[PDB]
Amino acid sequence: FDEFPIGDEQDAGILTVAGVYFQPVDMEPAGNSLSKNEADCHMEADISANEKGATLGYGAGDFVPYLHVKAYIQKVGSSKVQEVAFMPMNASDGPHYGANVKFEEGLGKYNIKFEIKAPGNDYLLHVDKETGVTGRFWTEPIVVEWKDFEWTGPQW
Amino acid sequence: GAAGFDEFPIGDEQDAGILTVAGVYFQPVDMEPAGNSLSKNEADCHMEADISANEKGATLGYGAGDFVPYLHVKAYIQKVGSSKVQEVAFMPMNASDGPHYGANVKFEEGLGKYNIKFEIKAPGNDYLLHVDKETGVTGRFWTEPIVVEWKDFEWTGPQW
Ligand SMILES: [Cu+2]
Ligand SMILES: [Cu+2]
Ligand SMILES: [Fe+3]
Numbered sequence A: 001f002d003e004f005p006i007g008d009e010q011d012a013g014i015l016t017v018a019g020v021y022f023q024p025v026d027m028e029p030a031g032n033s034l035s036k037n038e039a040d041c042h043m044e045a046d047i048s049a050n051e052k053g054a055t056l057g058y059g060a061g062d063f064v065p066y067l068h069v070k071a072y073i074q075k076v077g078s079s080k081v082q083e084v085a086f087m088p089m090n091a092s093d094g095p096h097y098g099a100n101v102k103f104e105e106g107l108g109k110y111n112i113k114f115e116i117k118a119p120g121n122d123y124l125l126h127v128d129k130e131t132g133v134t135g136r137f138w139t140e141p142i143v144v145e146w147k148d149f150e151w152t153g154p155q156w
Numbered sequence B: 001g002a003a004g005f006d007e008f009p010i011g012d013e014q015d016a017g018i019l020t021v022a023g024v025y026f027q028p029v030d031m032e033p034a035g036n037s038l039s040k041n042e043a044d045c046h047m048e049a050d051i052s053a054n055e056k057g058a059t060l061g062y063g064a065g066d067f068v069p070y071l072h073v074k075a076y077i078q079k080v081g082s083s084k085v086q087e088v089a090f091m092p093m094n095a096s097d098g099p100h101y102g103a104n105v106k107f108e109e110g111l112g113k114y115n116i117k118f119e120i121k122a123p124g125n126d127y128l129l130h131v132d133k134e135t136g137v138t139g140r141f142w143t144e145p146i147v148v149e150w151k152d153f154e155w156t157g158p159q160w
């Protein structure tokens, strides 16, 4: 299927973060986000480990699961910020974090932020010298932003 | 195996549905956060489920050989000829060889021949699938827990 980039890929710490969008989708189970006909698009964070990910045990290019991802969407010039939790899921092209999204201020230019929290107590690290890793997860969320995304309506 | 330390197989690697399941064990480890399993000095070994997608995994969007996250894994440890069952919840975690499900384990029944079962529950509400025709997948998660069994695992103490 056809994917449209929100911006250029961005590296942040051990992560490579891409944002794309395309037509809204049907999810099973439904999750938190709007149903397909209630939404403008599907939005996704493709989050993989870059070369620095080996400090935490990740292979380069691998998906990084158990993160907590949400998008902050703000029309440029506006005070209102829309927040959308993303969920981990598979499409036909593989795992990603995503949600169906309705742009609540309609057509126009937006600032799009992906807030990426580390796993927390869900996920452990081996830290012994024999089997463990010396990298560590980040305390405050990684925030990746694209500044002048133009929502121009259904391009599909 | 792991390029940076010594893993020992529990038995043959098995296929079950879209999953390729391998069981290994090695010296007990330190985890951060500590999680629910025993501390390094109190345990016999670390026990790990290596769960990846086989070729059938593409029906769910997985790439072949990719780690399968968000599963709920627990181990049932039963000495052959005994009625007592030890149950060990695994947690997701990273070692130097990457993500896996594991726990430190102390074999409560001592050295001997054990039946080892890994029961693997699907993600449920923790992982979604696209099911529309344009972007979605054709397969669905299993509803009944997958069970991978090794009937003659010999625990003979540390191998390290
Ligand atoms: Cu999605
Ligand atoms: Cu482990
Ligand atoms: Fe995608």
Ligand SMILES: [Fe+3]
Pocket (backbone or CB within 6 Å): B001, B002, B007, B024, B048, B050, B095, B097, B100
């Ligand atoms: Fe391993």
